[PDB]
């Protein structure tokens, strides 16, 4: 059968450089598609018959064609132009699309807002607490967050998640969860918790029953 | 001396399974019996345990009046019948015997694990302290915590909030369940007047859950 | 005023069937090509089923074939995408579309379709030494334990009589619910032609075992 | 009745002095145990009633306790004592367990040996590709194991495991998987797996069909 093959399957650029995303047929015809999907949303159009401009699309878009590569070129990459690029190939009524390629934009670094929230007193009467720590609204997204009660290095009981890169100001959120026993919980003083990025680490903390 | 346990496998929610504890080489109604349990990958917990001749019972605050630990001196076996299952007795349950100065014959351990169920969440609030220590931005959240299947949504005041929002994708944890948190930031100067509610819908379980996240003293 | 709404997806059972629902707006169904399109969470985009102009003709993604089928009823202005014998590769958002332009130019906003977990024996493949050593005389063989449920499985070795230099790794858990495993050891490659290495797996939740004779390529 | 065990985790060298330490709340009493747990395996008794050395156990565990302190001491670590260990407090028929220790043996570095496995004939009648990338008996732990498919950095398609730490030498071993479909196993060329440890990568590669 047909198959697309897409590269890069990711890249970085800043605002206004020029993007350019291939993608390479097996055997064809100019039926072929580019689509952007941006976080949790359906795929847009945005050119078909390989250079054909969907209306209403912005002219930064444009596709090309030589042989057997298909290539999306924007030419002045814009914040909101992050999402996940996909070509597509029409054959005899049979279709295949391309891994994709996510683009994500190249922006300056901003060092998070870093907030530690404390177990509710209603989750306490279950008897689990969760410990939730915020990284808002920084860049790059590698960062390294630790988790420490009474000044012991924990292990094994949180987890991570992670935003997609914000449309407007690019940059991610961050949250770390510690799960712990309300027995662990309340036989603890001090909870903190430690964003390390690059040559800074920044703890925030609170203790048990105070403020 | 030998200790063999049997019947752990896979159980429901809500449903029952009943260990069996085999003995060999000693009589156990002459011995305090125990079963101990270890989730994976942490540590020990006891759960039940029954006296000799006297067949007292003993049981760890999270399993009483669900579990129930029996002997039969006739099968020289004993017994942890386990009734209101749920996601955190998932667990290899250990059977031991103590003598002397403490649990001194252990069996191999019996696996059990508790499967998942439609489920709705918990919804805790995630609260802005009164105090700004951040310079007068304030972070305020929703956590939702132990539903399944994916996925949730989340809004906030029914959609008119929507400027500093972040809902994050959602976790899987050990447990099987899925957990996530949505937060937002604020200016401080607002949480005495402006109300916050999070809309938590899931329809896989036909749920809607509403928090109002109140600043905490 | 064009307007494309799925309904119908949720939980299925492997094995089990179910029916999503395509309602257009703002068009005539009978005169559009429609398409079913599939998405893997975290993974690209998957074309499944397409339905033709007034000819009703089918075509399909060598995935689906015999399992899935695309109708259509044009009194309903509905198009619709059959499912059956699911399987965990299923699971996915589905998106239908309308073809516009060459290409699929109105997309409604996709039905997640969740295929849980059912106890299943694992498939079990060789990971073949080479029979020319590229380690300086050390081969390095084992067994892949693949998509069972739930835990956990055990694996020896030649029944037990080959034990030093094997690592059975701990199982982990795939994206579609189920457990994968490999178990190795590594040997001398001037033993691949005289010995034999079989590995042993057993799956007592679901009541198997499988054994692999782990031959040179 | 509340244990607390300290630390929760600790390496030190063969031969080293190891220290555990367990604070009852309510304990006037000795009636504190401690038992290791190697992986898999049921806990094994080694101290009853805080100081009396169980039958059988090596001469080089003790038991003590230092006011509401109770102590663990392994007098000269070694490699078959990679264990979590545990304190244990018996009541009125009321039992309660510190939250563990582990102790992993720190021995001199040892780099791996990388074996990689391409996908069985078998595996791919079926249309999906598993790759597998073996570590064996290497230390430390921390390692970074990428792939490359016709030398593209992959992402999101790998997933590791790792062993516990081996009772003899003291050494890991880690797999890492890729899955791919059939269709894209079979269009592309070089597989290989990076691992860096240290100031030095090692790739293991291959290529399809040879
Ligand atoms: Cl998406
Ligand atoms: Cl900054
Ligand atoms: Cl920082
Ligand atoms: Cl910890
Ligand atoms: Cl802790
Ligand atoms: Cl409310
Ligand atoms: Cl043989
Ligand atoms: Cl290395
Ligand atoms: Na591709
Ligand atoms: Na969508
Ligand atoms: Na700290
Ligand atoms: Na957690
Ligand atoms: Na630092
Ligand atoms: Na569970
Ligand atoms: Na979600
Ligand atoms: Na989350
Ligand atoms: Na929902
Ligand atoms: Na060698
Ligand atoms: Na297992
Ligand atoms: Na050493
Ligand atoms: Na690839
Ligand atoms: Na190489």
């Known amino acids: 059968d047909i198959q697309m093959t897409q590269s890069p399957s990711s890249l970085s650029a800043s605002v206004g450089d020029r993007v350019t995303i291939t993608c390479r047929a097996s055997?064809?015809?100019?039926?072929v598609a580019w689509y952007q999907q941006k976080p949790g949303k359906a795929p847009k159009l945005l050119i078909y018959?390989?250079?054909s401009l969907y209306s209403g699309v912005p002219s930064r878009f444009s596709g090309s064609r030589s042989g057997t590569d298909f290539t999306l070129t924007i030419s002045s990459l814009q914040p909101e132009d992050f999402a996940t690029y996909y070509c597509?190939?029409?054959?005899?009524?049979?279709?295949?699309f391309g891994q994709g390629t996510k683009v994500e934009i190249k922006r300056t670094v901003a060092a998070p807002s870093v907030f530690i929230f404390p177990p509710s007193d209603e989750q306490l009467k279950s008897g689990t607490a969760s410990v939730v720590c915020l990284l808002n609204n920084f860049y790059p997204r590698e960062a390294k967050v630790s988790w420490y009660v009474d000044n012991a290095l924990q292990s094994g009981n949180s987890q991570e998640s992670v935003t997609e890169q914000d449309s407007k100001d690019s940059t991610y959120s961050l949250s770390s969860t510690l799960t712990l026993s309300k027995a662990d919980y309340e036989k603890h003083k001090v909870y903190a918790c430690e964003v390390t990025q690059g040559t800074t680490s920044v703890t925030k903390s609170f203790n048990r029953g105070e403020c | 001396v030998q200790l063999v346990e049997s019947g752990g496998g896979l159980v429901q929610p809500g449903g029952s399974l009943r260990l069996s504890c085999?003995?060999?080489?000693?009589?156990?109604?002459?011995?305090?019996?125990?079963?101990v349990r270890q989730a994976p990958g942490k540590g020990l917990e006891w759960?039940?345990?029954?006296?000799?001749?006297?067949?007292?019972?003993?049981?760890?605050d999270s399993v009483k009046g669900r579990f129930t630990i029996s002997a039969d001196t006739s099968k020289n076996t004993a017994y942890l019948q386990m009734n209101s299952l749920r996601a955190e007795d998932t667990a290899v349950?250990?059977?031991?015997?103590?003598?002397?100065?403490?649990?001194?014959?252990?069996?191999?351990g019996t696996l059990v694990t508790v499967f998942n169920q439609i489920q709705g969440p918990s919804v805790f609030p995630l609260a802005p302290s009164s105090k700004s220590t951040s310079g007068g931005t304030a972070a305020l959240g929703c956590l939702v915590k132990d539903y399944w299947p994916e996925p949730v949504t989340v809004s906030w005041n029914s959609g008119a909030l929507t400027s500093g929002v972040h809902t994050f994708p959602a976790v899987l944890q050990s447990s099987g369940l899925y957990s996530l948190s949505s937060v937002v930031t604020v200016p401080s100067s607002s949480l005495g007047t402006q109300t916050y509610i999070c809309n938590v819908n899931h329809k896989p379980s036909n749920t809607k859950v509403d928090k109002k996240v109140e600043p905490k003293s | 005023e064009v307007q494309l709404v799925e309904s119908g997806g949720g939980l299925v059972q492997p094995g089990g069937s179910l029916r999503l629902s395509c309602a257009a707006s703002?068009?005539?169904?009978?005169?559009?090509?429609m398409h079913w399109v599939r998405q893997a969470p975290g993974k690209g985009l998957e074309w499944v089923a397409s339905?033709?102009?007034?000819?009703?003709?089918?075509y399909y993604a060598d995935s689906v074939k015999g399992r899935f089928t695309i109708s259509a009823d044009t009194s309903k202005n509905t198009a619709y995408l059959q499912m059956n014998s699911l399987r965990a590769e299923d699971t996915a958002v589905y998106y239908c579309?309308?073809?516009?332009?060459?290409?699929?130019?109105?997309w409604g906003q996709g039905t997640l379709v969740t295929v849980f977990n059912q106890i299943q024996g694992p498939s079990v493949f060789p990971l073949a030494p080479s029979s020319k050593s590229t380690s300086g005389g050390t081969a390095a063989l084992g067994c892949l334990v693949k998509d069972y449920w739930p835990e956990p499985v055990t694996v020896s070795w030649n029944s037990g009589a080959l034990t030093s230099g094997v690592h059975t790794f701990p199982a982990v858990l795939q994206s579609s619910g189920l457990y994968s495993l490999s178990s190795v050891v590594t040997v001398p490659s001037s033993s691949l032609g005289t010995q034999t290495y079989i590995c042993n797996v057993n799956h007592k939740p679901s009541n198997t075992k499988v054994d692999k004779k782990v031959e040179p390529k | 009745?509340?244990?607390?065990?300290?630390?929760?985790?600790?390496?030190?060298?063969?031969?080293?002095?190891?220290?555990?330490?367990?604070?009852?709340?309510?304990?006037?009493?000795?009636?504190?145990?401690?038992?290791?747990?190697?992986?898999?395996?049921?806990?094994?008794?080694?101290?009853?009633?805080?100081?009396?050395?169980?039958?059988?156990?090596?001469?080089?565990?003790?038991?003590?306790?230092?006011?509401?302190?109770?102590?663990?001491?392994?007098?000269?670590?070694?490699?078959?004592?990679?264990?979590?260990?545990?304190?244990?407090?018996?009541?009125?028929?009321?039992?309660?367990?510190?939250?563990?220790?582990?102790?992993?043996?720190?021995?001199?570095?040892?780099?791996?040996?990388?074996?990689?496995?391409?996908?069985?004939?078998?595996?791919?009648?079926?249309?999906?590709?598993?790759?597998?990338?073996?570590?064996?008996?290497?230390?430390?732990?921390?390692?970074?194991?990428?792939?490359?498919?016709?030398?593209?950095?992959?992402?999101?398609?790998?997933?590791?495991?790792?062993?516990?730490?081996?009772?003899?030498?003291?050494?890991?071993?880690?797999?890492?998987?890729?899955?791919?479909?059939?269709?894209?196993?079979?269009?592309?060329?070089?597989?290989?797996?990076?691992?860096?440890?240290?100031?030095?990568?090692?790739?293991?590669?291959?290529?399809?069909?040879?």
């Open positions: 579309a309308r073809h516009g332009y060459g290409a699929m130019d109105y």
């Open positions: 703002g068009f005539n169904l009978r005169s559009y090509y």
């Open positions: 339905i033709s102009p007034y000819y009703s003709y089918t």
């Open positions: 055997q064809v015809s100019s039926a």
């Open positions: 018959s390989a250079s």
């Open positions: 597509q190939q029409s054959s005899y009524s049979l279709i295949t």
